[PDB]
């Protein structure tokens with residue numbers, strides 16, 4: 100079970116049984132800004148259970164994230180994958196992504212289930228409305244207060260010093276460095292440094308130039324999230340050497356994000372440019388290779404169950420309707436992506452042991 104391997108996990112799926120309505124599965128098709136173009140693509144919400152907002156279909160069908168049994172199935176699959184850590188997509192209590200409902204209520208249950216399968220839960224902080232340095236304090240406080248004690252709560256052990264919580268900050272570049280430095284530097288007017296609320300804050304690097312904003316912000320590390328090789332500077336495999344080199348010089352944790360593929364045309368019909376066919380695992384293994392070549396301190400997987408963007412490694416099954424031939428993992432099995440992860444997790448976990456200075460050779 101590899102505690103250096105994180106996977107982005109979403110708890111925002113709903114269905115009438117547990118949640119009394121479909122949530123996320125019944126995703127609306129997102130309009131292109133330009134109506135001249137949008138009118139030539141589909142319109143409306145998908146109609147689960149047979150029409151979902153995904154190119155792929157799950158073994159668990161149009162499941163509820165709040166289904167105790169689904170959570171369990173999810174832990175089992177991540178444990179089979181040799182992934183120690185799910186990075187849970189998070190919105191403050193009583194707040195939600197624009198196409199979902201609140202999910203903070205469900206964190207306690209997800210922690211209990213991670214524990215049951217000997218897994219760790221860290222927090223992927225989404226761009227909630229008017230997110231800034233001040234409510235980021237209130238909310239880092241909230242996360243560590245309410246869930247910090249829990250045995251499944253994730254802390255990144257340094258060989259020396261306290262183990263520190265990790266916050267992955269999605270779209271960190273939205274907030275100016277001088278505001279971040281209020282929270283993330285020692286002298287910050289609202290610094291969490293050397294306090295009960297310290298942690299490792301990982302910035303999303305999109306453009307090369309964000310390097311310097313991230314340095315100035317006082318962030319501990321950078322990650323790249325996007326599963327499409329070439330989508331951003333940061334999500335392009337060729338640039339991962341440079342970011343590793345950069346982070347090393349500046350004592351930042353470089354966390355590359357690897358995807359098995361991308362396809363979101365079920366809900367962004369204009370976004371074909373960023374489709375990546377899986378070619379039966381070869382895309383995902385190129386990604387995993389490029390990541391391990393940087394001898395990184397952690398690796399992130401985009402994603403476990405982002406079904407809308409077709410980046411999920413969660414088990415998928417062939418399915419056809421009167422209009423739709425869903426993608427699937429044929430000729431391989433529903434677990435191909437869980438198996439390819441196990442393969443590369445064990446290979447990482449072995450090479451990673453030869454990195455430390457006190458474990459170098461003649």
Ligand SMILES: CO[C@H]1O[C@H](CO)[C@@H](O)[C@H](O)[C@@H]1O[C@H]1O[C@H](CO)[C@@H](O)[C@H](O)[C@@H]1O[C@H]1O[C@H](CO)[C@@H](O)[C@H](O[C@H]2O[C@H](CO)[C@@H](O)[C@H](O)[C@H]2O)[C@@H]1O
Pocket residue numbers: 188196197198199225226269270305325331363366405407408
């Ligand atoms: C132009 O915007 C995109 O690209 C920039 C970087 O150049 C990002 O900083 C933006 O956040 C944005 O990336 C998101 O959207 C693109 C599509 O353009 C997608 O390819 C990405 O993977 C990003 O969105 C996903 O991941 C984040 C993090 O977990 C999450 O907030 C997003 O949630 C949105 O998309 C869902 C459908 O895919 C939708 O249901 C939800 O309500 C949205 O907030 C995506 O999971």
Ligand SMILES: [Mg+2]
Pocket residue numbers: none
């Ligand atoms: Mg050190």
